[PDB]
Amino acid sequence: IRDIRYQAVDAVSNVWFIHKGVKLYLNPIISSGLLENFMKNLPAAIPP
Amino acid sequence: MDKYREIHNKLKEFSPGTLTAVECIDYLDRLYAVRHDIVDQMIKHDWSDNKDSEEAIGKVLLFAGVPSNIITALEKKIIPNHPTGKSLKAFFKMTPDNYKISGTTIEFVEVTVTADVDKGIREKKLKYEAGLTYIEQELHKFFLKGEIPQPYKITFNVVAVRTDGSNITTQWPSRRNDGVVQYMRLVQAEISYVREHLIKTEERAALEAMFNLKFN
Amino acid sequence: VLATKSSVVANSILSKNWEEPYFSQTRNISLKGMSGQVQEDGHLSSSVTIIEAIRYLSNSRHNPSLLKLYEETREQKAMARIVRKYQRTEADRGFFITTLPTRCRLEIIEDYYDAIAKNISEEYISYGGEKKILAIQGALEKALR
Amino acid sequence: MMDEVSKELIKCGMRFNTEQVQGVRHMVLFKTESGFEWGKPNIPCIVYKNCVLRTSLRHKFMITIKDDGLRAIAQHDEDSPRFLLAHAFHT
Amino acid sequence: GIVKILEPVRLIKSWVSRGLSIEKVYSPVNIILMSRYISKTFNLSTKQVSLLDPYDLTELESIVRGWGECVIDQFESLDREAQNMVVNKGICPEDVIPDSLFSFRHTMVLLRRLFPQDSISSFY
Amino acid sequence: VNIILMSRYISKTFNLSTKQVSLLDPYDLTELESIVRGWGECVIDQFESLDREAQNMVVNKGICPEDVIPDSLFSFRHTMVLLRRLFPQDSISSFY
Amino acid sequence: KILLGSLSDLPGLGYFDDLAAAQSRCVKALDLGASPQVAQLAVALCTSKVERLYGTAPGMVNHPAAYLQVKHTDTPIPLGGNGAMSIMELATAGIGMSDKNLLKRALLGYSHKRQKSMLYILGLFKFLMKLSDETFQHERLGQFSFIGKVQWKIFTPKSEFEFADMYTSKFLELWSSQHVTYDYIIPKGRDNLLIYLVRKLNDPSIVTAMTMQSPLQLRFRMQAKQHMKVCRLDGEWVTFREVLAAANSFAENYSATSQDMDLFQTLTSCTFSKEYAWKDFLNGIHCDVIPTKQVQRAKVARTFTVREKDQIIQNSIPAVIGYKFAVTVEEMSDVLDTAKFPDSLSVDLKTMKDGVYRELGLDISLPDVMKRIAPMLYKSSKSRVVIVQGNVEGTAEAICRYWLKSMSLVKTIRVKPHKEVLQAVSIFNRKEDI
Amino acid sequence: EVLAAANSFAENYSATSQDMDLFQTLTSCTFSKEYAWKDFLNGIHCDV
Amino acid sequence: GQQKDLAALKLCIEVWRWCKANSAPYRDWFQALWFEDKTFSEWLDRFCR
Amino acid sequence: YLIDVLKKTTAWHIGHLIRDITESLIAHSGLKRSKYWSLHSYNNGNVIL
Amino acid sequence: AAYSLIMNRAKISVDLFMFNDLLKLINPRNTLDLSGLET
């Protein structure tokens, strides 16, 4: 399926992800409009 | 003084966050001018020298009985220690804030109001004392050659007063410290006020850049 | 002739803006060819002005001015080379490419002389584009008279 | 100026020559509802004859103020005739 | 259609870069004015920061970012200047802006949500 | 209820027994009368029940005194700046 | 020299860019002294060559009419377009003026009556803008003017240049988005200037200029002739036919919006620089043949300027735009250094906002609004030198009139509207008027 | 007199964006039904 | 209105598909993610209704 | 006086033929197609490439 | 109300008096010092 608006996704509460015991906070990704970049393993630039 | 009253009258009618950056800059410049003027006035009344208008170094020497011919001859000379190689004529053109003549001794004082006392002191020294000492050697050589009956003595004293006036009495043990420090405390409030209040939040960066270029 | 135009000559020389950063101007980040550094094989490398500017900016810690850049690279020996591929740019005129310090020195000399020469352009030097015809027309009028 | 010249002609015993035409090919002085204008009128109106627009015809004064500052009269020198310099009683 | 992620830590680390920081113009005096306002009005020693919501904590850190970088190094002089400005003349505790990114309402509502206070004291 | 809440707020925040209203500027008095018009007609006749309801609403859950809307023609910013200008307050206290 | 060099070199940046380069240098040849007829012949030859190379002409695969329900003439230039404009409009109006005229006609048609063939053109323009808003924003700044264009592939490695592979593409994009003031002013400090230069090095136009006389350019030509993946449709490489099909699909189901109408009018409306209205000047002009023998005079070079700067704004438009967009201290220092009148920057910005609000309902206070509308409002102020024969005055009107009288190689031509019909108009011109 | 005043007003009439917008709005939206009926009447063929 | 519902449904489809490919809190995320002016849980409720 | 005169010239058609030949040669110049043989003909089989 | 404000402008409106009564009910000694007439 194409024409998916990942930039329109908004984060209201805390968003958490678990990967091999590693806890990740995806709320800044949603706020930065980089949902698609992490969605399909695509390059991006983030502040440290 | 009355300048502070006019500034306060102009600035009590401005709502917070309604002044353009350039307006804030020139109001601040006026306020620093007022602070410098009130310190000049405290020193004025301390020395009781009613020299309302600043006079040039050549004019001060003329008031000291120095003949004009030797001054004209010296105008052609050049300061060897001047950082910019300015001529003696331009150094005579400039007017110190205050002066005093007592017999053969002339006292020159430059006053600045800033937080960094040492930086202002050294800046005023590198601006004044080189030419002052060159003039001192020139007049000493003239006295040795016999064109003046009595040698002249020159003294340069620079005093910097912090923005809070804590050390103003230490440098200037005057009787009038209280009123002057109260007045100067007010100017700080006014400057800080317009600087961080009447200024617009969309032009704070513009104000910071203009302040850095003008004063730093 | 130049002594009667001292004020304008001084103004023209001072208006060349010797205090601005060297690499902030367009002419020093253009695509004109420029010799690079000596490679391992011993042959000078053909490069571009923008690449050499980037190299110097990467090696240096600040963006120096024209005078500062000349002072920093004063001891550097001037080097020159003939282009690998001719022209390669609409602004590339000539057959030789030099190094960055050489370009800096030639720029200093060229700017100073252009400033000192643009003032007498009304009579002797025919500056193209705007007043090229005027000096030659005056000379021809004097000759015919 | 039309009023002044009309008064002068009335004092002299004649009146303006007025012709009602639907259009004039040349520049003539014509009177409309809004006033007097110069040009070529293409509308049936009143055109004043013997009117020529001559563009080729193209200092210290003292002012006396009356009506608390509503009308002004000026003249060249003390002996000059008095004329109404300005007035605010317009529409 | 179907995508699988096996190295998300390295995926994020590949995105890490410097220079893309949104700096804001700080007002050194105004920052400490709002600091004094918050300290006086609100009791920050009631609820532990550990149990606070990370969603609100991130916003609080973002709105407080870089506040002390201009006032921690120079504190006594800035405090003296602020005291002179606040005593020599009246200053509105709301019109003052610490930095361009600061938003008043949002800051107060977030502070009240994080640190609830009894409205009877404000009213009665 | 919002009328009585905002009235109490104004009562506590500002000291209204300092400057005589007779010598106040008519231009500002007009605007104050405009923004306070009709408040009395809704609360004087029935006050105790309204005051108890206001207490009940404000004590249980928090109320921010910048969102209370006494009527449809009320602006917090304009009313507060008008009241600041009419009745000066020493800003030193707020920051000290 | 320019006429014969217009042929061999292939910019390889796409149909629109190659066509624009050929037309612009034909205009330059006309400036150096070429007759308008020879310039027109050269324009036709270069247009035919580029159309055949890209397949745009009717008779082969890449013809737009086979994939769009719009006339060949009405298709936007970035798509399959007809670059057979008169040399007069190219020299006087500009290069991308065909798209502007098409958009103006489409908006005029959309009013009065609400048809579908014109809303189709509006949808095509919106699709072009959507494609354009996926690359560097400074590409639209400077160079030829365009509403939007299709991006084409770069068939050369990035490792050829030593310092290209220092900052990643995503790094450069995010730095450009964060630092938008550097699109209009050149950074001074090395920290920003190095990134600016690295971004400049990766520019496709500059890359092609650096590889202009290299065998690597044959790659793009062979890919284009074979009709392979050369364009972009979303994050994937697509063929030109796919771009045409996507444009048709987007335009057939496009709904007009009030904000979209305002932005289209922003494109159609006046400019920040005083521009002469060449369209109505040429439409209302008339030339008459006078039976007088041709007289060969000398040659003199005159400065033909088409875009001036409003005198009310004491600072250059890039300086004011960068000052508005500058949020960091060092950006402010750079814009103050570049600006000749730093104290009047706030006044110029206020007048800019007031003029925009007066002529348009759009408010530049919001950073997004000014960011989107600035490139379509500010255009470059490049000056040109045109070789003229006789007493042609140093004004744009005089140069244009000389070109009109120069259409006939033998017959003397007289222009009936001999009065001054200049239309020096700007956004703030109407403000000064009211 | 009314006719003469109308002629005087109309001879010097200058186009206005607001007036043009109003006329466009009328002729395109307000009188739409009337023009629809007019087009109905125009585009009908009757054979005897 | 149909286009917005279609977009919301497609976004939900994609996010759930990825959450199933990985290990994610489906219900928690559907109560946190927001589309337009409707949360994902409300979007699912509307789709059901 | 130029295009009409030169249209009937032999040089016009010769140039067009050379253009077609150059197009074919450029097509063969690809990296894949370079190391293989090829054959083309033009003008009713009169000219063979 | 506009007529009353225009003509007199020296007598406060009944709205201000009612507001003063409300303030007295809430907390006396913090009321507006009223010395003008009504209407």
Q: Is E41 helix (H, G, I), strand (E, B) or coil?
A: helix
Closest to E24 measured CA to CA, from G180, G193, B201: B201
d(C-alpha C58, C-alpha F22), whole Å: 74
Amino acid, single-letter form, for residue D60:
K
d(C-alpha A35, C-alpha A26), whole Å: 9
Resolution of this PDB entry, in A? 3.6
- Token pair in block for residue J36: 């293989």
d(C-alpha B38, C-alpha J21), whole Å: 93
B189 closest CB neighbour out of E30, E84, E97: E84
Residue B39 in contact with residue B184, Cβ under 8 Å? yes
Q: What are phi and psi of C70, to 5 degrees?
A: -60, -45
Q: Is A22 helix (H, G, I), strand (E, B) or coil?
A: strand
d(C-alpha B203, C-alpha G323), whole Å: 10
- Chain E: nearest CA to G194, how far in angstroms? 12
Q: Which long-range contacts (CB under 8 A, 24 or more apart) does G58-65 make?
A: G61/G227, G61/G241, G62/G227, G62/G240, G62/G241, G62/G244, G64/G244
Neighbours of chain F (3+ CB pairs under 8 A): E, K
Q: Is E114 on the interface with B (CB under 8 A)?
A: no
Catalytic residue among B51, B76, B77, B124: B124
State how far Cα J37 lies from the chain centre: 18
- Chain B and chain E share a number of CB contacts under 8 A equal to 58
Residue C118 in contact with residue C13, Cβ under 8 Å? no
Residue G124 has a CB neighbour count (10 Å cut-off) of: 28
Residue F5 has a CB neighbour count (10 Å cut-off) of: 22
Residue B140 has a CB neighbour count (10 Å cut-off) of: 15
- Token pair in block for residue K4: 């009353």
Residue D23, burial from CB neighbour count under 10 angstroms (0-12, 13-18, 19+): exposed
Residue G262 has a CB neighbour count (10 Å cut-off) of: 14
- Chain D: nearest CA to H15, how far in angstroms? 21
Q: Which residues of C touch G (CB under 8 A)?
A: 21, 23-24, 26, 29, 31, 47-48, 50-51, 53-55, 57-58, 60-63, 85-89, 129-130, 132-133
Residue B196 in contact with residue E85, Cβ under 8 Å? yes
Q: Is E4 on the interface with I (CB under 8 A)?
A: yes
Closest to C13 measured CA to CA, from C2, C27, C24, C28: C2
- Chain B: nearest CA to G339, how far in angstroms? 12
d(C-alpha B193, C-alpha B198), whole Å: 7
**In angstroms, what CA-CA distances link E5 with A44, E9, G234, G276?**
16, 10, 22, 58
Q: Three-state secondary structure along chain G?
A: CHHHHHHHCCCCCCHHHHHHHHHHHHHHHHHHCCCHHHHHHHHHHHHHHHHHHHCCCECECCCHHHCCCCCCCCCCCCCCCCCCCCHHHHHHCCCCHHHHHHHHHHHHHHCCCCCCHHHHHHHHHHHHHHHHCCCCHHHCCCCCCCCCCCCECCCCCCCCCCCHHHCCHHHHHHHHHHCCHHHCCCCCCHHHHHHHHHHHHCCHHHHHHHCCCCCCHHHHHHHHHCCCCCEEECCEEECHHHHHHHHHHHHHCCCCCHHHHHHHHHHHCCCCCCECCHHHHHHCCCEEEECCCCCCCCCEEEEECCECCCCCCCCCHHHHHHHHHCCCHHHHHHHHHHCCCHHHHHHHHHHHHHHHHHHCCCCCCCHHHHHHHHHHHCCCCCCEEEEECCCCCCCHHHHHHHHHHCCCCCCEEEECCCCCCCCCECHHHHHHHC
With tokens 């009791």, the residue in question is: E43
Handedness of CA F24, F28, F30, F33 (dihedral sign): negative
User: Can you list the alpha helix ranges (DSSP code H) found in chain C?
Assistant: 6-14, 49-59, 66-72, 100-117, 132-144
- Token pair in block for residue E107: 């800051």
- Token pair in block for residue B169: 């009495």
d(C-alpha G328, C-alpha G330), whole Å: 6
| Inter-chain touch I25–A19, beta carbons under 8 Å | no
Residue G316 in contact with residue G377, Cβ under 8 Å? no
d(C-alpha I32, C-alpha A12), whole Å: 5
Interface test with H, best of D33, D40, D42 (most H CBs within 10 A): D33
Q: Is F17 on the interface with K (CB under 8 A)?
A: yes
Q: What are phi and psi of A4, to 5 degrees?
A: -115, 125
Dihedral angle over CA of D42, D46, D47, D50, nearest 10 = 180
Q: Which long-range contacts (CB under 8 A, 24 or more apart) does D22-31 make?
A: D27/D53, D29/D53
Q: What is the DSSP string of H7-48?
A: HHHHHT----HHHHHHHHHIIIIITHHHHHHHHHHHT-----
| Inter-chain touch E23–G168, beta carbons under 8 Å | no
Residue G361 has a CB neighbour count (10 Å cut-off) of: 12
With tokens 């571009």, the residue in question is: C48
Residue K39 in contact with residue K9, Cβ under 8 Å? no
Residue A25: list chain E partners with CB under 8 A: 54
Residue G241 has a CB neighbour count (10 Å cut-off) of: 17
Q: Is G367 on the interface with E (CB under 8 A)?
A: no
N-terminal to C-terminal alpha carbon distance within chain H: 50
F47 closest CB neighbour out of K25, K30, K32: K25
Q: What is the DSSP string of F3-67?
A: HHHHHHHHHHHS--SSS-STTS-HHHHHHHHHHHTTSHHHHSSS-HHHHHHHHHHHHHS---TTT
| B40 labeled part of a ligand binding site | no
With tokens 């012709």, the residue in question is: D19
Residues in chain B: 216
d(C-alpha E34, C-alpha G394), whole Å: 61
The reply to whether B124 belongs to the active site is yes
**In angstroms, what CA-CA distances link B111 with B39, B129, B186?**
8, 14, 19
B192 closest CB neighbour out of E25, E29, E99: E29
- Chain H: nearest CA to G206, how far in angstroms? 45
Half-sphere exposure of G115 (CA within 13 A, CB side): 13
Of chain F residues 35-94, which have a CB less than 8 A from chain K? 36-41, 43-44, 47
| B97 labeled part of a ligand binding site | yes
Closest to G13 measured CA to CA, from G142, G155, G122: G155
B209 closest CB neighbour out of G332, G344, G347: G332
- Token pair in block for residue G392: 């042609």
Q: Is F77 on the interface with E (CB under 8 A)?
A: no
| B110 labeled part of a ligand binding site | yes
d(C-alpha I25, C-alpha B98), whole Å: 79
d(C-alpha B127, C-alpha B108), whole Å: 13
Residue B8 in contact with residue B195, Cβ under 8 Å? no
d(C-alpha E25, C-alpha E28), whole Å: 10
- Chain A and chain E share a number of CB contacts under 8 A equal to 47
| Inter-chain touch A46–E55, beta carbons under 8 Å | no
Amino acid, single-letter form, for residue C90:
E
Amino acid, single-letter form, for residue G46:
C
- Chain K: nearest CA to F40, how far in angstroms? 5
Neighbours of chain J (3+ CB pairs under 8 A): G
d(C-alpha G17, C-alpha G10), whole Å: 10
Residues in chain C: 145
Helix G258-268 × helix G117-132 angle, to 10°: 80
PDB experimental method: cryo-EM
Q: What are phi and psi of H46, to 5 degrees?
A: -120, 125
Residue H24: list chain G partners with CB under 8 A: 111-112
G175 closest CB neighbour out of E19, E23, E100: E19
Residue G304 in contact with residue G399, Cβ under 8 Å? yes
User: Strand D45-48 and strand D28-31: pairing?
Assistant: antiparallel
Q: Is A38 helix (H, G, I), strand (E, B) or coil?
A: helix
Instruction: Tell me which DSSP letter residue I35 carries.
Output: E
Q: Is A33 helix (H, G, I), strand (E, B) or coil?
A: coil
User: Strand I33-35 and strand A9-11: pairing?
Assistant: antiparallel
Residue G78 in contact with residue G148, Cβ under 8 Å? yes
| Inter-chain touch E95–B197, beta carbons under 8 Å | yes
With tokens 């202009």, the residue in question is: G212
Q: Where are the beta strands (DSSP E) in A1-48?
A: 9-11, 16-19, 22-25
- The backbone region for C100, taken as left when phi is positive above 0, alpha when psi lies in -120 to 50, beta otherwise, is alpha
- Chain I: nearest CA to E112, how far in angstroms? 22
Closest to E28 measured CA to CA, from E57, E68, E63: E68
| B54 labeled part of a ligand binding site | yes
Residue H14 in contact with residue H20, Cβ under 8 Å? no
| Inter-chain touch E9–A37, beta carbons under 8 Å | no
Q: What is the DSSP string of E56-78?
A: HHHHHHHHHTTSTTTTTSS-HHH
- Token pair in block for residue F77: 């910013």
With tokens 């966050």, the residue in question is: B17
State how far Cα E104 lies from the chain centre: 10
d(C-alpha G117, C-alpha G252), whole Å: 9
- Token pair in block for residue B135: 């003039």
Residue G361: list chain H partners with CB under 8 A: none
Residue A44: list chain G partners with CB under 8 A: 170, 174
Maximum distance among all Cα pairs of chain F, rounded to whole angstroms:
42
